[PDB]
Write a structure and sequence with these properties.
monomer; alpha/beta; Nucleotidyltransferase, domain 5; eight-stranded mixed sheet; two-stranded antiparallel ribbon; 7 helices; about 35% helix; globular; binds magnesium ion; Terminase, large subunit; hydrolase; DNA-packaging; Small terminase
């Protein structure tokens, strides 16, 4: 049921924090996981580069919404923030990552030019999960207590009987991971418009 075990064996309360207003010197980045039948997710991550601490500050998750509807639901916080997004092509062909990113850009999101990668061009999920777990354990990854869809997924994220990530209920998790991977594109809060 939880396979060979949960991926993040960390008490939720250790990574949960009270919401606060973003300081001018924090960096801000958004991320998107695409989805129609599956939920899509749009998240916002704050990065204190001085303390090197990450805050998952905003989360929106919803099935069967268009890009126009997503923008209407999150534009209050998503406006002008660069957006990381997945998909180097293949999902039984047709318009995957790049065509969907266009629909989202047209809807008003500041979509980043390229799909989410680490600095070296890689996109390993395993690598992202390891780095995120380290941050959690070191007290350097926090989630606002108002971002409940993160915790819902966090609780269920597990590996199958052979040790592979079971890729379900992981839209907010994926988005969070994309924002983290692309953190070099995060913009300083005071330079946004402030
Ligand atoms: Mg789909
Ligand atoms: Mg998904």
């Amino acid at each position: 049921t939880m396979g060979s075990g949960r991926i993040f064996q960390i008490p939720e309360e250790t990574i949960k924090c009270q919401p606060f207003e973003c300081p001018d010197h924090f960096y801000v980045i958004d991320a998107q996981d695409f989805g129609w039948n599956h939920p899509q997710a749009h998240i916002q991550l704050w990065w204190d580069k001085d303390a090197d601490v990450f805050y998952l500050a905003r989360v929106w998750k919803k099935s069967e919404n268009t890009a126009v509807q997503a923008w209407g639901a999150v534009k209050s916080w998503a406006n002008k923030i660069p957006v990381a997004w997945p998909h180097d092509g293949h999902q039984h062909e047709k318009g995957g990552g790049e065509q969907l990113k266009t629909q989202y850009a047209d809807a008003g999101f500041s979509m980043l030019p390229d799909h989410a990668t680490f600095p070296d061009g890689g996109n390993s999920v395993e690598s992202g999960i390891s780095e995120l777990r380290d941050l959690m354990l070191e007290g350097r990854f926090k989630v606002f207590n108002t971002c409940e869809p993160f915790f819902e997924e966090f609780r269920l994220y597990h590996r199958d009987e052979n040790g592979k990530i079971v890729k379900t209920n992981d839209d907010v998790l994926d988005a969070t991971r994309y924002g983290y991977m692309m953190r070099r594109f995060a913009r300083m809060m005071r330079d946004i418009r402030k």
